[PDB]
Design a protein around this ligand. Sequence first.
Ligand SMILES: Nc1nc2[nH]cnc2c(=S)[nH]1
Length: 341
Amino acid sequence: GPEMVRGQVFDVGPRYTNLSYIGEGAYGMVCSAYDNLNKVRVAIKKISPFEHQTYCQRTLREIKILLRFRHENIIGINDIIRAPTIEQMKDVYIVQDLMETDLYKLLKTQHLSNDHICYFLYQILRGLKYIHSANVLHRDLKPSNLLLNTTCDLKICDFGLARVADPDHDHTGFLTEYVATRWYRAPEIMLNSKGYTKSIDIWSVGCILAEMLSNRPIFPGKHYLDQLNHILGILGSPSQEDLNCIINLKARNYLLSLPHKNKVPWNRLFPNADSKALDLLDKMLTFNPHKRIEVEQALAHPYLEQYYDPSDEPIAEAPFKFLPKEKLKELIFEETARFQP
Ligand SMILES: Nc1nc2[nH]cnc2c(=S)[nH]1
C-alpha cells in the first residue's frame, strides 16, 4: 500500500517518509518529505500528465530542461520517482531541495530592504543569464516561480512553459497571443509578438522588481484585455519611433486610436526606492522590446555593482539549438530513466 495524502495516492516511499501536505501547484499535489538517504527534508511534486497531450508537453519540457541545467539560481531535480515500466507508469514524482518560501508568499507579508531587493534581483538575473545563454526562454517568470530558502538563496523554478528562442519567427497579429502570466506579460504579447524572444523574460523581471519595491503588482490587469491598459497608464503613450517599429496595422492603429497618456515618473510611484534601482527598472520596463535592456546589460547596471562579477556568472555548456501523448510518455519515461535503481 502506497502512502496516502488527503485521500490521494502519494507513492514516494520507502526512501521518502513523514509526508506533509504543502499545497497545490501548477502540476498538482505538493508535499514535503524526509529523504532517508540524504537525511534532509525535500519537496516532492506529483505530476499526472499522461491522459492529455498538452500536459505531457509541459511535463517533458520541465524535466528535460531542468535535468540539463545546472546552476545555483535554478532549482535542481534531485530525483524522479516513477513505476519501473511504461505500462505501470501513471504518476511521476519530482524531488527537489525543500525551500522555505517563494517570492509570492514573501511579498504577501514582508517588506524587503533595499539590500534584499538588490540581492534577489541579482540572483534572478544571474539565473536568467544562464537560461538565456542556453537559448531558452522561461516565459513564465513571476514571484511564485522564484523559490527562497531560509538564507535567501533564490532559485528559479518551473520550466514547463519554456521555449527555445526563435526571434526570426516572433511576429504575429494583434490580440492573439497567450504567453506568461497576465500581470507579468510584456505589452508586445498583446500587440504583435508570439513571445519567442528573450526580451519577454526581461519584462517579467521588470514587473517583479517593481513588485519588490512596493509589495503590489505594478500592472494589475483584471483580465487579458485589461493588461495593456495598465501598462500604458504608467509608461504613457508610445513614441512615433516605437510605433514605427510595429508594422502590423491592427496593432499600430489600436495604439494610435488612444488619447494621449503621460508617463508616470517611477520616483513618484516609488518615492522610497533607490534611484539606481529605478533607473534599471525603467530599462527593463521599456515599451519597445528592441530597446529593452538585455540580461547581461542588466547585471552590469550600477544598481547591482556590489554583486556583479561576469566570471562568477556562468553560462550553459550545452544550449538547446533547436507528438501524440503516447510518444511523449515514452520520452518522459526515457528522460527519467537515470534515476532508477
Ligand atoms: N516549500 C517548497 N519547496 C520547494 N522546492 C521546490 N519546489 C518547492 C515548493 S513549490 N515549495
